[PDB]
Amino acid sequence: ADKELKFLVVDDQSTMRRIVRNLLKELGFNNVEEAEDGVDALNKLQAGGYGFVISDWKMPNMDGLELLKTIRADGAMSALPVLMVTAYAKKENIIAAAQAGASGYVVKPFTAATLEEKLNKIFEKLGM
Provide the binding-site residues for ligand BEF, judged by CB under 6 A.
56-58, 86-88, 108
d(CA 100, CA 102): 6
Q: Residues touching Mn ion: how many (CB under 5 A)?
A: 3
Q: Which residue is nearest to Mn ion (CB)?
A: 58
Answer for which of 4, 25, 49, 58 binds Mn ion (CB under 5 A) is 58
The nearest distance, CB 57 to ligand BEF, in angstroms, is: 3
Query: What is d(CA 52, CA 26) in angstroms, rounded to the nearest whole number?
Result: 17
Q: How many CB atoms lie under 10 A from the CB of residue 80? A: 18
Question: Which C-beta is closer to Mn ion: that of 1 or that of 38?
Answer: 38
Element (H, E) at 34: strand 32-35
Q: What are phi and psi of 68, to 5 degrees?
A: -60, -50
Q: Which of residues 2-21 bind Mn ion (CB under 5 A)?
A: 12
**Nearer to Mn ion (CB atom), residue 33 or residue 128:** 33
